[PDB]
Design a protein around this ligand. Structure first.
Ligand code: ZN
Lengths: 141, 65, 53, 83, 167, 71
RNA sequence: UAUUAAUCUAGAGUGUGGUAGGGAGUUUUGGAAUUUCAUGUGGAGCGGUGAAAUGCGUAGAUAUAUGAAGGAACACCAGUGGCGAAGGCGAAAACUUAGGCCAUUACUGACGCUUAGGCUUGAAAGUGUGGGGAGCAAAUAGGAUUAGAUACCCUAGUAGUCCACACCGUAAACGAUAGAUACUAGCUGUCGGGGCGAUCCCCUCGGUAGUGAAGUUAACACAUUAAGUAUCUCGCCUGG
């Protein structure tokens, strides 16, 4: 509430999110701020249901003109993040599209891939169970 | 110590404070640098400009006292 | 630079002013490029800022 | 010598609409006129030529936008001299 | 826009014909008026101009269209009696905002600070005092409202204390 | 392991156990190391003069201790 | 994602107020100094270099003081400075004109970035035409040095160096670092804007320097103005 600091979104949502999360992970920071989008929302909750980040609350002004969102990252007392590596395959002008029969498994299943086939974000294993392939957002491991 | 900034002079013009500009001219008809006048860079530039205009207007000498 | 009262006290400042006059006169008697002017002037300013502080 | 406030009311559609592209294109046309007079007066003021090119291209982008969004939006604006 | 001009007359001649020259060059202007003829009197020249050693300095304070000066410019150079024709405009670096004009306070307080006629010469113009009026006049807010109540979490510390025990 | 009297310019991640005390003032130094010395001497069966002492023993003589900033 | 129907303002522009700056062009002025001439003062050397010597000098040089002329460039202000997209911009003034900075509830409503091709600019040198030509100085001659010297030094000395109109379009045209966007420790400065408010200091928004963490780097080093974390686009490279 009342962040009293101007913020501006970089560019395409997936990259705008990944750059911030990686910089925060390296800088040992706690939270970062960015404008909110439905795809960014979906990826945020699909991540947190995997337990890879702490509190994330979408925030708006005293109106529905601007909506922003912040998030904290899953840490430990020894101060080590739960994220190890992040890389996006989808890219503006370089969209990837993957049939289920050739779906890749991140780091022998240890990593997480985001595949928004037709119903939004979903885990790679639950998509294999669905045997539904499609567009791939990014690698998280 | 920029006395102009100290007093908030806020404006300089040729014919109001001529003696304030002789105080800044060296005895040998040259402009004294920052190390002597102690003014800020912008006031010092304004003083140099005004002293050049006076130099033009035959108000201060060129090469002697 | 007119300053002399009795014997010698003016002469020390005379050496000072003669030194600065020679300094100002040496660089207007031999020609070389304007870039050399600027670089040498900055070098002299750096010497003043590093030695006299 | 440009009287910025005067021309604004000419093409103005409302009381306090200043971002309506008609006023900007009108001011750009007047500025281009003045800068053309200046350039023909001073054949060697090159930075004025740079500014004039910038302004005419800015007008080109504004008019491309306008003619793109709505076809009937610029019906009253073709009355202004162009091309 | 304001205009300021300094006039140099041909020196040793009497003061009256200098004012005649004042009026003569006053007719040299275009449709501009609203000035004062105040002059600075006779002053010794800092250096010879052609052969004279002194002159009188005359001023105008009018303000008019850009056409004003050109005819005066081509007249003054021809007139042998008038010598120096500085033409000041508002292109000088200036400021007269009403919110900043009342700096006479700074003048007066600097003067009291300088006014140390007493024997106790302990005051120093170049000396800090660490004062604070604390006029913020800046908050730059950006209000936010709660739209979602996603997975909760708590806070903790970053103190490091390892090895548990010795043996 | 290592324990340190970490001033404000130290690097916390290096030292194992951190004690944020001011080492510039000699009185603070003597205080801290005397409490440490008695904390180990009580395990050495010696009386802890400055450790667990209520009061009226901690105060040690000191030349005028001020001016934390240094040139 | 693409298409299309719409809506909003943070993106991006326009307005408002405040604001700096050697930004540029055109039109005028000034003074030092050199050179030439003239006027007096004066009688043998001057200049020159490591040392000398062509060269200049009683037909009065150098020097000293004054006056006239013309041409070129603008010490001292001048900076761990400012502006410009780049090349560059600093004695004074006027006109025209550029873009820039801070707060902008105002307006408009995604109108943006990149940009093949196209267009504009672009240091010096050089070309054509007419001027101008003080000093400097390619080429050229002479005196020295050397074994030789078509060079380094000296005495002259032409183009040119300056202005007006057209052309050339190259440079170690460099931060050897394409542009745009967001994030990521810190510290020391400096300059511009706002407020508090004698400067001194406080902070805010920006530019410009130094130091320096992680990170990157083959290393050197870079590091909030990245050569880091990434994305978009253009251009480029494939041993000598
Ligand atoms: Zn000042």
């Amino acid at each position: 509430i009342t962040t009293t600091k101007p913020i501006k979104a970089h560019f395409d949502p997936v990259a705008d999110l990944l750059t911030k999360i990686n910089n925060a992970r390296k800088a040992k920071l706690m939270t970062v701020t960015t404008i909110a989008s439905k795809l960014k929302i979906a990826i945020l909750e699909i991540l947190v249901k995997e337990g890879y980040l702490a509190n994330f609350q979408v925030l708006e002004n005293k109106s529905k003109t601007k909506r922003i969102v912040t998030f904290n990252l899953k840490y430990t007392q020894r101060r080590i993040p739960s994220i190890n590596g992040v890389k996006q395959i989808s890219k503006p002008g370089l969209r990837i599209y993957r049939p289920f029969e050739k779906l890749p498994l991140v780091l022998n299943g240890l990593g997480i891939a985001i595949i928004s086939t037709s119903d939004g974000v979903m885990t790679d294993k639950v998509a294999r169970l669905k045997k539904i392939g499609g567009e791939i957002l990014a690698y998280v491991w | 110590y920029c006395r102009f900034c100290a007093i908030g002079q806020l404006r300089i013009d040729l014919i109001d404070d001529l003696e304030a500009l002789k105080r800044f001219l060296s005895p040998y008809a040259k402009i004294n640098p920052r190390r002597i006048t102690g003014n800020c860079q912008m006031h010092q530039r304004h003083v140099a400009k005004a002293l050049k205009r006076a130099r033009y207007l035959a108000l201060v000498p060129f090469v002697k006292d | 630079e007119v300053k002399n009262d009795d014997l010698e006290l003016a002469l020390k400042k005379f050496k000072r002013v003669s030194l600065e006059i020679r300094r100002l006169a040496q660089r207007h008697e031999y020609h070389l490029r304007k870039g050399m002017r600027l670089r040498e002037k900055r070098k002299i300013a750096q010497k003043k800022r590093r030695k006299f502080r | 010598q440009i009287d910025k406030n005067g021309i604004i009311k000419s093409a103005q559609l409302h009381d306090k609409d200043v971002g309506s592209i008609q006023v900007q294109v009108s001011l750009l046309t007047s500025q281009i006129k003045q800068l053309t007079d200046h350039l023909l007066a001073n054949k060697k003021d090159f930075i004025s030529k740079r500014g004039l090119y910038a302004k005419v291209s800015k007008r080109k982008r504004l008019l491309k936008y306008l003619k793109h969004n709505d076809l009937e939006a610029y019906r009253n604006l073709v009355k202004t001299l162009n091309l | 826009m304001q205009y300021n001009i300094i006039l140099l007359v041909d020196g040793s001649l009497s003061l009256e014909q200098a004012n005649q020259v004042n009026e003569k060059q006053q007719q040299t202007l275009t449709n501009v008026e609203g000035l004062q003829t105040e002059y600075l009197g006779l002053k010794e020249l800092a250096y010879p101009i052609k052969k004279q050693l002194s002159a009188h300095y005359y001023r105008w304070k009018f303000s008019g269209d850009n056409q004003s000066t050109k005819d005066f410019k081509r007249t003054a150079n021809i007139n042998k009696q008038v010598l120096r024709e500085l033409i000041i405009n508002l292109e000088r670096e200036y400021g007269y905002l009403a919110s900043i004009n009342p700096k006479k306070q700074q003048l007066a307080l600097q003067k009291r600070a300088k006014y140390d006629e007493i024997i106790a010469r302990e005051n120093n113009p170049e000396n800090p005092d660490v004062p604070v009026t604390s006029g913020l006049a800046s908050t730059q807010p950006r209000l936010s409202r709660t739209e979602k109540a996603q997975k909760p979490k708590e806070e903790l510390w970053d103190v490091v204390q390892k090895m548990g025990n010795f043996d | 392991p290592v324990v340190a009297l970490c001033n404000t310019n130290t690097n916390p991640e290096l030292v194992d156990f951190i004690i944020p005390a001011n080492n510039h003032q000699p009185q603070s130094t003597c205080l801290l190391m005397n409490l440490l010395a008695d904390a180990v001497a009580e395990a050495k069966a010696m009386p802890t003069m400055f450790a667990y002492k209520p009061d009226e023993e901690i105060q040690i003589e000191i030349p005028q201790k001020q001016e934390a900033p240094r040139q």
